[PDB]
Structure formats: C-alpha cells, structure tokens
C-alpha cells in the first residue's frame, strides 16, 4: 500500500489526460482521493471501482456537500471479475500486480476507450516503450504496438510517494487503435510466444523444439479435419513432412537467419501470412 | 525357541566399546535378561534369547536397537534412555542428500553444523531434546519423532547456507513454543 503524496505531479497527470467536459471516465484505483475530485470537477460522470469498502465509504463521505456529489459512481469488487460500464477515457493508479493482464483487458473491450493515463513500473514502462532492435523489445512490446499506441509522459521519482518505495514509477499514455487491426488475436499471440520463447535465436532454430512441432501437427490435423482431406503417407508422424513445409516457408520469408528481437512488425506479419497460405495455424 | 541377532561393529568403534563393555553387559542381563557374546573373529556382537529367560521378544528388539544406536557413535546415557523408553528413534541422513556440497564447501557445512566448540549443535541439544552425532559426512539424530523432525528441519535449513543467527532465532522460537505444550 503506497500513497502518492506529491501535490505537483498530480495536476500534470490531470491535464495530460485530455478530458473534455463531456467524457465518461473510468478512474480505476482512486487511492486517497487527491486525483479523483478534479476529474469530478471537469467531467460530467466519473465511475470509480474500489476494492476496500472502508475506503469507498471514506470517498463517498468526502464528496458530501460538494456540487459534484451526484456525478460520482462507486463500484465494488475485484477489477478482473466485474463487468465494466460504458466509459470514454481511463485513468489507472492500481497496484502493479495487475499490470500485465489488464492492459490486454483494455484491448479486448468492445467499443474500446480513446485515451488512458496509466501509472506503471519503470521496467514495465520501458518494456512497453521498446522499439525493435533494442534490448527491451519483447512479446509484450510487439503486442502493445499491435493493439495500441504508447507514449511516455514524465518520470516519477521514488520520494514522491508515502512511503517512498525502492523503485521508480512512470506515467504512460495509451490509445486503442480505431479501428483495430484485422489480424486474428490468438494466432498472433501463439506466433509471438513461439518466436519469443528465446529472444536471441533465429526463427528457424526456434521451430526445432518438440512441443511446437507437436502443436503444429495437432493444428494441421484439425485443419484437415474441418477441411475434410485425407492425410497422405509419412515416414513417422506426418509433421516431419510438415518440417520441409516449414523449411520451404523459410525460403521466401528469408527469416531463417534473422532473429525475433531484431525484426520489425512487417516481417512478423509477412511470416504469419506465410503460414496462412500454406495452411499452418496456431489456434 | 532361541533367537539370534548379529550386529556388526566398525573397527574404529571397537576400542570405545571395550572401555564401555563392563558398563553394558551387566544391565543387559539384570534388567533385560538377554545373553550377549562378543565375537572378535567376525568383529560382531551376538544377541540371543532363550525361553528360559524373560518371555519378551521386544526385549531382544530393544537390545538390538540399543547396540545399533551405540555402534553408530552415540553416548552411553542416550542409549540407556533408548532402552528405558519406547519412543526414541534415529534419523540418519547425509549432507549431499540435501544439497550437493563438494570440497571445502562440505567441510564448511560440517563446521557450520558443529560451530565453535560444538555449541551451536549443543544449542539444538538444548532446544529439541534430541541427540545429534556427526559422522565424517553422515549425521544421526536420536529422540522423539516430532523432536527428530524439528531437529532435522533445523539442521537441514542450516546446511543450505543459512547463518547461525537465523537458526538461533528459530531455536529460541521453537523452545518457547515447545515448552508450553
């Protein structure tokens, strides 16, 4: 439990949220309340979700007598299990343990929000803001570059919190792409998992393990199952034949010597299409 | 219905055994009534019972466990306490069966187990009511089942590399928790 005690960076967080007076705000993790009241002042409706009933009671006690009392809604329960209402923008000051999944929760939401101001860890913010070719470009970086757009805003020091933690915090701004890309999500996630199981090997060496070949063989059996074609002869299992098929794919993508951490977006998209025309799928 | 138990003794335990021999064969025949032989040709001890003695096979088993505890290197009074009670058991394990330490690491681990003048080991002797004897690399713990379990937990946690201050605090905690129940 940490409390943002700095009364100076909070105004910058407020003004960098880009709130017009006709927005709906999902203000997740209100904290003490140094940030929520200005959002009530400059937005027509704010819906905040709180896990502590005592702190929600304190927050709804703080708004008594204030003219923005009737524009605040308070939801209870865990964030990853409730159904969110309609909201235009998002502001997150959550504990860091829910950092990794919930950004994908901002991805999979129907009618996704326009802008979100997120307070994350320094390592997590550097991993999200990681260009290809650097030392921090990972699967999460490629996923957030696919389904969103990220921009760091300012640094947050250690001595700006009560108590001052060991790590440094960061403020990032995320926008969901409107419209979203028409690539299929779980195939992309499986492809990135396979190619980013090791950041520094080549793609051809990354397609030599037993489990990846077995799951691709199962996917090929499933594809031939709903496409209704009989499996031809093979020396052992048929995936060995698919091995040369995979080999043939690595003769036009030219990615058998390139590496996952040093490849940009277009090479991954071309490689995914390369499995797409040869009837190889990940999910 | 004579029953015989053959117990083999290491040669390096032979010389203390004789120095305690006159201490051990009279009690074995005055409160236990089992006939004893020391066969130096095969370097062993024969424990035999006959129905002319006390009708008690558990007496023979207790004598066998007593001399098995003695031949591992335990003290005489601890083996006598094993004879008098029915609860005392002997855990036996090694340093390498917990975590592989080789070379000077094994020597440092044994020195951590013993400590200065053995006193850290003696601390366990004051905190678990057990009896720990150290071989060259094997260790043996004698006592009650929960007592040897907690002594094993302490000595295993100390083997891995934990400082003696942490196990001192753990021994104080378990001495406070065990004396009240």
């Amino acid at each position: 439990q940490h409390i943002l005690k700095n009364p100076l960076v909070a105004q910058g967080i407020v003004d960098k949220a880009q709130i017009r007076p006709s927005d709906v705000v999902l203000e997740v993790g209100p904290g003490t309340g140094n940030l929520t009241v200005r959002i009530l002042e400059q937005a027509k409706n704010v819906v905040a979700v709180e896990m502590d009933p005592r702190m929600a009671a304190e927050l709804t006690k703080r708004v008594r007598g204030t003219p923005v009392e009737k524009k605040l809604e308070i939801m209870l329960g865990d964030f990853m299990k409730t159904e969110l209402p309609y909201f235009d923008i998002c502001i997150s000051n959550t504990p860091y343990q829910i950092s990794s999944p919930l950004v994908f929760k901002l991805i999979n939401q129907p009618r996704p929000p326009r802008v979100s101001i997120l307070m994350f860890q320094r390592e997590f913010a550097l991993r999200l803001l990681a260009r290809p070719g650097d030392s921090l470009y990972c699967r999460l970086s490629a996923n957030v570059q696919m389904w969103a757009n990220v921009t760091h805003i300012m640094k947050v020091g250690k001595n700006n919190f009560r108590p001052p933690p060991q790590v440094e915090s960061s403020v990032v701004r995320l926008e969901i792409k409107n419209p979203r890309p028409q690539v299929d999500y779980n195939e992309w996630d499986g492809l990135l998992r396979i190619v980013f199981v090791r950041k520094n090997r080549t793609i051809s060496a990354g397609f030599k393990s037993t489990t990846v070949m077995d799951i691709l063989e199962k996917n090929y059996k499933t594809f031939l199952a709903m496409n209704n074609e009989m499996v031809d002869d093979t020396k052992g299992s048929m995936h060995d034949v698919v091995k040369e098929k995979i080999d043939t794919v690595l003769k036009e993508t030219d990615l058998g010597d390139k590496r996952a951490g040093k490849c940009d977006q277009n090479d991954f998209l071309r490689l995914l299409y390369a499995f797409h025309q040869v009837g190889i799928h990940f999910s | 219905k004579f029953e015989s138990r053959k117990i083999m003794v290491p040669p390096h335990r032979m010389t203390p055994l004789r120095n305690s021999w006159t201490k051990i064969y009279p009690p074995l025949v005055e409160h236990l009534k089992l006939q004893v032989r020391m066969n130096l040709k095969t370097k062993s001890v024969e424990l035999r019972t006959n129905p002319k003695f006390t009708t008690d096979p558990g007496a023979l088993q207790k004598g066998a466990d007593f001399i098995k505890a003695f031949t591992l290197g335990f003290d005489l009074d601890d083996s006598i306490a094993l004879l008098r009670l029915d609860d005392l058991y002997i855990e036996t394990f090694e340093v390498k069966d917990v975590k592989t330490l080789t070379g000077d690491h094994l020597s440092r681990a044994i020195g951590r187990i013993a400590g200065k003048d053995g006193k850290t080991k003696f601390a366990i002797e004051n905190a678990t009511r057990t009896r720990i004897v150290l071989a060259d690399s094997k260790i043996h713990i004698l006592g009650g089942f929960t007592h040897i379990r907690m002594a094993r937990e302490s000595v295993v946690s100390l083997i891995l590399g934990s400082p003696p201050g942490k196990v001192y605090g753990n021994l104080r905690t378990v001495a406070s928790r065990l004396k009240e129940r």
Binding site: - | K6, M8, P10, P11, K43
Partner: protein, 216 residues
C-alpha cells in the same frame, strides 16, 4: 467377498544335491483351473535364501543364493542355481578407509552353454610391522593383481560346468587360489567372490535335472 487365500494351495520348494540342507521352504500357488495351469506359472520364480540356512553353520551368513524354478511334479517343485550375492552390510563392513579396493569381473561360457559373469573383490592391508597408516598399492600392482584374478577365474570356470563350480564355491577354495597366486605381488587381505549371475542359458535338459535331483 472372494477370499482367494482359502482358494490357494501350498507347495514345497527344495534345493539341489550340492547343498546339505536341500529343503528350502514353502510357497503358495492358486488352483490350476481352466485356461490357466499351475506348472507354467512356476517356471519364472527366483527364490533367495541365505547360505547359512542351506549349510547349517553361521560362517556363510553373508552370502545369499538366488535359485530359479525348473520342474514341478507331485506337490514337489525342483529348482536350479541362478546366482550368488553378498549381503550389503558385509560390503559396508569390508570397505573401510586407508586401503585400496580392487575389483574384477570376467564373463565366461562354461563347458555347457551357461554364459556367466563373475565378480571378485580384494583389499589391501599392513603386514603387522608397519608404522605407515594407509598402505595403498601402486597402479601397476593393481593391474597385475586384476590380471591374475581374471585369469584364475576364467581358468576355474571355463573348464567345468556349474555343478562342480558351485561345489567349489561352497568351500571358497577360489579365495585360497587367488591368495596363493598373488602372495608375491602384494599381501592382499580379504578376498571374496562377491557376485555371480546367469547371463545365457541352454535348453531345459530335464535329464541333467533328474541327475542332480532325485533325493529324499
């Protein structure tokens, strides 16, 4: 609800004529009902028994004999030799510090088609006037001792069948032969043939079994 223990019967397992105590013990088999005979189920068992129970005297208490099972008739099932092993505590008593452990093994087919492997062990000692604590052996002595042990073992087992082999293994004259052969190379206390085992077998040969068995 079934209680198969009342269904099962007992059988008496016996030892060959080489050992003095040719009665081993008792086992239990199910009934020879339909589609499952009792004779075929008694062709793969291997019993084990200490040699002191087969010879009476306690000087062979550290050896144990594994016996096969060969032919059952008239509530009596007759066996054959399958192997000899040492008890583990005997090895833990024999192997002590400040001495050299010499081990040898030889695979030999006998006069009949009994392919066997033989394991022999030896240790070093001090000859009663030695102030030196350890008395190890140089590797040249160890290699020569291993060569002599191997040639002695293959000479002993190559020119004979298993019957006289085990009737020589009972009084352990091979240890005396090895000690006398290697007495001019190093002292070498405590020689034992620690393990023998069958590896390859000929056909059933009921005539040899009836020659070996058929007593009582």
């Amino acid at each position: 609800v079934v209680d198969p223990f009342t269904r099962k019967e007992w059988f008496d397992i016996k030892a060959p004529s080489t050992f003095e105590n040719r009665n081993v013990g008792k086992t239990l088999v199910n009934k020879s009902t339909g589609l499952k005979s009792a004779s075929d189920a008694l062709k793969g068992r291997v019993v084990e028994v200490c040699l002191a129970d087969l010879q009476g005297s306690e000087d062979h208490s550290f050896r144990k004999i594994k016996l096969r099972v060969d032919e059952v008739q008239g509530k009596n099932l007759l066996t054959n030799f399958h192997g000899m092993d040492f008890t583990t505590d005997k090895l833990r008593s024999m192997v002590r510090k400040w001495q050299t452990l010499i081990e040898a093994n030889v695979t030999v087919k006998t006069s009949d088609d009994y392919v066997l492997r033989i394991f022999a062990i030896a240790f070093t000692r001090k000859q009663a006037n030695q102030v030196k604590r350890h008395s190890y052996a140089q590797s040249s002595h160890i290699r020569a001792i291993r060569k002599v042990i191997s040639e002695i073992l293959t000479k002993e087992v190559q020119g004979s069948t298993l019957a006289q082999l085990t009737s020589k293994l009972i009084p352990e004259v091979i240890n005396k032969e090895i000690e006398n052969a290697t007495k001019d190379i190093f002292p070498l206390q405590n020689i034992h043939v620690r393990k023998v085992k069958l590896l390859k077998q000929p056909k059933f040969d009921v005539g040899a079994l009836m020659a070996l068995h058929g007593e009582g």
